[PDB]
């Protein structure tokens, strides 16, 4: 009659493929469309391990790797001196903002390189970013930046993919050879490449003309990473479950802008030094429940067809 | 001209098949997505019986057969011993909730048991059901529990698929044979798989990380029935069409929370004593509706492909 | 370069098929879905003749033709003596309601039949409908609205697939030979089959369990409209484009029972009076805009795929 | 390990197409639907020039070019003689509404043809559009029109498929030969070559009987532009988005009503003369962020299928 228990593990295999969907089939921009973060779960696994053993480092460019995947916004209303710091100390990373002169940013980067675990650092420096236009004033910006201490640049564009940004990608490259490049905004596969093709070290991810986050992040990703570029998710995500998602379609790090914004360190959330922590072991433990180990194995596992999603209704 | 009337029975065979949509064809992660109980419909059949004559005896576990299917949900808010007795007398059954100490879990336990027709009963005294964690102290709390009588322990986890939980399941029928273990939570095949393999007597269906309800209890009891594991609907029912849908896509029995809370024998809707027979009636009902004379009929004629369904847009 | 507008009617055939879906296309189950009129718009076609000559003319049942397609529902807040003499007059019928002794019913069936162009008439004497339940007293309450004059009878239902049902359509056909019989309700083929079967002059198409009204009367009408056994659709339309859409996915009449609460003649919307005239002009300029002269030709367009629709995102 | 950057732009060769939707896979009336404006963006693509380089010449019938794709339509709360000229000197053309004596809308045509860089000119003249019905009143109308000057009439009908439509357009182009003819209101392809048959200089696109915007936009234009007919979108744009996607669908306008109720020059937004600046430089930037140097090349593009789509969930 009933099939008996002892062969369960084995029965599986009457099976053509797993519960759920591959994160190929969830991304079908011909069947399902354009996909947001809110538009689908990500079914859970086998739990083998504490969420503490869960290891969070983050490839934020080519050569710089962070502790946990948490990324400041460059925006006048999140990201100052104080906010790179703390971001830093909690093993992540600040964009500095540049709704600012040239001489006041470059002094809000020396004061995060002069700043004496997770912790994020270069030198023994704690690390920062920096974000800058591609106008020709931001030339003698950059210089001053870098001049400042500078660690990586974030190109600040809503539309990445112009002459503008390749030509100021080919110039940093030329001239400051040991300053890691973010370029962007882009939502495609194409603008993508054209980018990395300049020499961009990573891309930010995000924008009549645009496009859903979670298509956007999935194959921008699917393409940039098979070159070694990490990409960070810089669609507005809001809590735990967007920044699990954004990362399970293919982004390294992900950027905060309103989920920081309030907080103490800010120029009321509270302290980033409680919120990013809580942040941390909710990732940890979104790992933990897909049956992960790190945010290297959760990259392999989805790209392998491993994790599984489920498209939501409405 | 017109076709003859006589012959009506007869062309339904030039037809490829019934109207409506079978559950496999329903259930299609990769046209429709996942569902909730909201998104679709059974399709009424042929009344052929009085709504008095449906029988309602459902599978709670492996062991034990309800005559109906209702269960209380081991919710501090919701199940004690008032809310298990009352379950029990009823012909469902309850759960008795773990915000509380072990000596005080037992002592409700023990109530139930030492209380004095369609009445669900072990001994001949009322079954009673109570929920534990893995946790080490959870098999000591278990031990007492066994000890106060009781008949089935549900365990107790958002995320079931756990080696902590299949170590805990293993260690029960070893030490306590004669009691029935229902594991979860889970939403999928392989979870469902995994605790299967372990020993589970029954399953618990419910859940960054999770799934509609609809296709998690459809995947995971499409499954779980050939082993002839029982799985409890537990995603939060609210009405007696939720009830319903949810023993028409492969549930045994049904839990219900928030539906019971308020209620006059919860730690207003009034008496459970009238609502569980309002609910029973209800699902009378719908069986007549639907054309089948028991929850035993109805999962095979469902499986079948005889019950049909229909996506609703919404 | 451009092409000659001389050829633009020719070159409609370098396409597969016409621009939009075709009825069939639009109800599919398996792609779209269940549909209510909501979820679909008529696509437009030729207009080569004034409204004002469009025939509205509609099949009740087998052997009843009505100048209109409006039906009033046997509720007790819509139809009585008044609402059932004017919808006659103006060139609908009326269906009295049954929450009501059997003489009381009786006596309104004889007010209509002893009340003294468009006009609905067997006799000479307006038609009259009335429901009934299939319980054993119905069967005297018949008899005496026969007696009274009674031209047709709606069996009232939610589920009128049942044995009780079909035992009191053979019945009446046995008994009341020229009394005509509209069974209900039902919602898809295989209830359409037995009632057909079971010898019913019509249906009334509407209803845990249930259906979306259009795709609903789309396949219970695909089927039952071959054996000439008109379908009214009550699923409780509140606009013209509500009775427009019911017509063309197959219904031969539309049953009105919340758009008539209210009205003068209902037991404020004004007089019926003045709104079924309306209703009768907006229908005659919907087949208008799509290019059809009748409701006959209507469905004979729709069937033939020559109609076309087009499914609305929401 | 990693794919080498510089082979980043060949790479893009191992896919099958690019990235993102064609046109005609977005707009499939069997799988996707029918859809708005808001249910789809366009896809960035390459910035190689300044936007302000970006020409937006676009065909208002076969024979009359507008520097801008904006007319205003006729309705009594958005066009006169006032709106008409200020529409005219900034590039694009009003049509003056017919909700007025006939001797009432000529003056106000002749109005704007007696006022003395973009500018919208015949004679030297501004150009002036005016709408009539099709009724038999509407021929001394029109005289009146032609007699003051008009360029382009429109005939105003919710549905322009009629034989009344056809016999006014074909007296038309042989009594007045030298005055452009737009045609309409159309959803259908068939719709679009009757009308384009009997002569029509251009089409106006729009519509329980109905189409959504975006698909009737597409499917029109698909079969006009073969014709080198061009077509207004008149289904109410809101917005700049709305015209990119617009013209992104295949029209060659777009008309303006409640969008320009409430400006100065209306019968408060402020004046026309900085809201269509501004719309004009928006939609500069639209072309820019897309890739493209003009109206033209952009229509070209979307029919070869490299600007790109996304449809967008709920």
């Given at each position: 009659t009933?099939?008996d228990?002892?062969?369960?593990?084995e029965?599986?295999?009457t099976?053509?493929?797993?519960?759920g969907?591959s994160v190929?089939?969830?991304?079908?921009?011909?069947?399902?469309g354009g996909?947001?973060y809110?538009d689908f779960?990500?079914?859970p696994?086998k739990?083998?391990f504490?969420?503490s053993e869960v290891?969070?480092?983050?490839?934020l460019?080519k050569?710089?790797?962070?502790?946990a995947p948490?990324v400041?916004?460059?925006?006048?209303?999140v990201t100052?001196?104080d906010?790179?710091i703390?971001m830093a100390?909690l093993?992540?990373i600040?964009?500095?903002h540049?709704?600012?002169?040239?001489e006041?940013?470059?002094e809000?980067?020396?004061?995060v390189?002069?700043?004496?675990?997770?912790?994020s650092?270069?030198?023994?420096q704690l690390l920062?970013?920096?974000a800058?236009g591609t106008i020709?004033?931001?030339?003698?910006?950059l210089?001053m930046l870098?001049?400042?201490?500078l660690?990586?640049?974030?190109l600040?564009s809503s539309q990445?993919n112009?002459?503008?940004?390749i030509?100021?990608?080919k110039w940093i490259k030329?001239?400051?050879?040991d300053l890691?490049?973010?370029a962007?905004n882009?939502?495609?596969?194409?603008?993508a490449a054209?980018?990395i093709?300049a020499?961009a070290?990573?891309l930010?991810?995000?924008?009549a003309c645009?496009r859903?986050?979670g298509?956007?992040?999935?194959?921008?990703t699917?393409?940039?990473?098979?070159?070694g570029?990490?990409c960070?998710?810089?669609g507005?995500?809001?809590?735990i479950?967007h920044?699990?998602?954004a990362?399970?379609?293919?982004?390294?790090?992900?950027?905060?802008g309103?989920?920081l914004?309030?907080?103490?360190?800010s120029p009321?959330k509270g302290?980033?030094?409680?919120?990013?922590?809580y942040?941390?072991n909710?990732?940890?433990?979104?790992?933990?429940?897909?049956?992960v180990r790190?945010?290297v194995?959760?990259?392999?596992?989805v790209?392998s067809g491993?994790?599984?999603?489920?498209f939501?209704?409405?």
């Amino acid at each position: 009659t009933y099939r008996d228990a002892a062969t369960a593990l084995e029965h599986l295999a009457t099976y053509a493929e797993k519960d759920g969907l591959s994160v190929e089939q969830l991304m079908d921009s011909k069947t399902r469309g354009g996909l947001t973060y809110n538009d689908f779960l990500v079914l859970p696994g086998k739990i083998d391990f504490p969420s503490s053993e869960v290891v969070l480092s983050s490839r934020l460019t080519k050569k710089i790797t962070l502790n946990a995947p948490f990324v400041s916004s460059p925006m006048d209303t999140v990201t100052e001196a104080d906010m790179a710091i703390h971001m830093a100390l909690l093993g992540g990373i600040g964009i500095i903002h540049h709704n600012c002169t040239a001489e006041e940013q470059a002094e809000m980067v020396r004061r995060v390189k002069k700043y004496e675990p997770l912790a994020s650092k270069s030198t023994k420096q704690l690390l920062c970013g920096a974000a800058i236009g591609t106008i020709d004033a931001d030339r003698q910006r950059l210089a001053m930046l870098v001049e400042a201490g500078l660690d990586v640049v974030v190109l600040d564009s809503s539309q990445g993919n112009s002459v503008f940004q390749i030509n100021m990608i080919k110039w940093i490259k030329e001239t400051f050879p040991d300053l890691q490049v973010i370029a962007g905004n882009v939502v495609t596969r194409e603008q993508a490449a054209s980018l990395i093709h300049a020499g961009a070290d990573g891309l930010r991810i995000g924008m009549a003309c645009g496009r859903p986050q979670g298509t956007a992040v999935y194959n921008v990703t699917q393409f940039a990473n098979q070159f070694g570029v990490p990409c960070i998710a810089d669609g507005g995500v809001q809590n735990i479950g967007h920044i699990t998602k954004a990362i399970a379609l293919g982004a390294s790090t992900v950027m905060m802008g309103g989920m920081l914004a309030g907080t103490t360190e800010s120029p009321d959330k509270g302290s980033i030094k409680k919120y990013i922590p809580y942040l941390y072991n909710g990732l940890q433990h979104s790992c933990q429940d897909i049956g992960v180990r790190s945010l290297v194995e959760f990259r392999e596992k989805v790209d392998s067809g491993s994790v599984r999603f489920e498209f939501r209704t409405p």
